[PDB]
């Protein structure tokens, strides 16, 4: 088993595949988990999603690296055997966009916040091939997110980064907060180096209001949690201002 220094541990319901871990969350949704080995510190887990939508699959976030992201595509090929139509990546940091080149080599259409694509070169990332844009209330402009099936993309405002986006899975009670949301038992909001400490609390709450009936909150570095992940994150963020 993989025992990361940071990130959730393995429990019943987890499938080890190569260097990665997969967990079924719903009949059509799986969480992918990949691990960055930090020398002298140990492994840091990062989570994303895989969603089946009829005869195709949709991905949220890459793994940390190209090779790990290729392993995600191999797991999808083995376990689902349907083509990946597109991937949405949730901001320009390594845990979310480190594996773009693997997606592109596979011919998968990639989407990110226009701002994430603009920041990518400055963050040592490769931009997605398509840019999402957002309304004044945070909802994605639908013309920029064609054929997204159940993925409902919401920009909650600046928080963990200025470009962080979130994704609800329509037809389920699952919503994905990425690195913006930490779990209900977290001590810290994680890396605040690129964070907006003034607006973080409002952005966390806006995510909760965007998906008000999501009962399972998925996030980058903990196991899926209740809505208390959202409220606890917001309460921690209240202390930043
Ligand atoms: C788990 C993290 C504390 S690190 C990760 C991200 N950092 C990276 O992807 C870095 N490339 C990195 C550097 C050193 C060690 C691990 C990751 C960030 O800055 O938000 N997301 C952070 C977070 O979600 O709070």
- Give how many domains the chain has, as a whole number: 1
Say whether 191 counts as a known binding-site residue. yes
Measured in angstroms, how far is the CA atom of residue 159 from the centroid of ligand 1? 14
Q: Are 64 and 98 in contact (CB under 8 A)?
A: yes
* Residues spanned by the domain of 71: 1-241
Q: Which atom number of ligand 1 is nearest to the Cα of residue 41?
A: 15
- Which strands, in side-by-side order, build the sheet including 216-218? 151-154, 166-169, 174-176, 216-218
What length is written for the chain?
Answer: 241
Q: Write down the residue that tokens 């989407």 correspond to.
A: 111
Q: Among residues 212, 159, 177, 23, which one has the least CA distance to residue 90?
A: 177
Q: Which two tokens stand for residue 2?
A: 């993989």
Give the residues across from 88 on adjacent strands: 60, 111
CATH number of the domain encompassing residue 95: 3.60.15.10
Q: Which two tokens stand for residue 31?
A: 């969480």
CA torsion through residues 14, 226, 29, 77, sign:
negative
Distance in angstroms (rounded) separating the CA atoms of residues 119 and 196: 15
Distance in angstroms (rounded) separating the CA atoms of residues 216 and 59: 18
Q: Are 71 and 19 in contact (CB under 8 A)?
A: yes
What experiment produced this structure?
Answer: X-ray
Distance in angstroms (rounded) separating the CA atoms of residues 76 and 60: 13
Q: How far is CA 129 from the centre of its chain?
A: 18
Q: Which atom number of ligand 1 is nearest to the Cα of residue 46?
A: 1
Helix (H) or strand (E) holding 88: strand 84-89
- The CB density around residue 69, as the number of other CB atoms within 10 Å, is 29
Q: Are 64 and 47 in contact (CB under 8 A)?
A: no
End-to-end Cα distance, the chain = 40
Q: Are 220 and 178 in contact (CB under 8 A)?
A: yes
Resolution in A: 1.3
Which residues is the chain interrupted after (C–N above 2.5 Å)? none
Measured in angstroms, how far is the CA atom of residue 95 from the centroid of ligand 1? 7
- DSSP state letters, 2-62: ---SBSPPP-TTEEEETTEEEEEEETTEEEEEEEEEETTTEEEEEEEEEEEETTEEEEES-
- Three-state SS across 98-151? CCHHHHHHCCCEEEEEHHHHHHHHHHCCCCCCEEECECCCCEECHHHCCCCCCE
Whether ligand 1 lies within 6 angstroms of the CB of 44 is answered as yes
Whether ligand 1 lies within 6 angstroms of the CB of 46 is answered as no
Whether ligand 1 lies within 6 angstroms of the CB of 93 is answered as yes
Whether ligand 1 lies within 6 angstroms of the CB of 179 is answered as yes
Say whether 232 counts as a known binding-site residue. no
Whether ligand 1 lies within 6 angstroms of the CB of 97 is answered as no
Whether ligand 1 lies within 6 angstroms of the CB of 220 is answered as yes
Give the residues across from 86 on adjacent strands: 58, 109
Q: For residue 5, give Cα distances in angstroms to 12, 23, 40, 115, 177.
A: 19, 19, 11, 31, 21
């Amino acid at each position: 088993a993989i025992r990361p220094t940071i990130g959730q541990q393995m429990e019943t319901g987890d499938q080890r595949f190569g260097d990665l871990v997969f967990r079924q969350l719903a009949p059509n949704v799986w969480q992918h988990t990949s691990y960055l080995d930090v020398p002298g510190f140990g492994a840091v887990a990062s989570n994303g999603l895989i969603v089946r939508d009829g005869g195709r699959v949709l991905v949220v976030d890459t793994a940390w690296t190209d090779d790990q992201t290729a392993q995600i595509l191999n797991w999808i090929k083995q376990e689902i055997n349907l083509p990946v139509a597109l991937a949405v990546v949730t901001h320009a940091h390594q845990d979310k966009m480190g594996g773009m080149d693997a997606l592109h080599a596979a011919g998968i259409a990639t989407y990110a916040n226009a701002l994430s694509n603009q920041l990518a070169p400055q963050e040592g990332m490769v931009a997605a091939q398509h840019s999402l844009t957002f309304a004044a209330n945070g909802w994605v402009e639908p013309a920029t997110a064609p054929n997204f099936g159940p993925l409902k993309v919401f920009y909650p405002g600046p928080g963990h980064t200025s470009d962080n986006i979130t994704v609800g899975i329509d037809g389920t009670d699952i919503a994905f907060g990425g690195c913006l949301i930490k779990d209900s038992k977290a001590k810290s909001l994680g890396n605040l180096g690129d964070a907006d400490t003034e607006h973080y609390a409002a952005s966390a709450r806006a995510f909760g209001a965007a998906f008000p009936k999501a009962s399972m909150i998925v996030m980058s570095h903990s196991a899926p949690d209740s809505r208390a992940a959202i409220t606890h994150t917001a309460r921690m963020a209240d202390k930043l201002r």
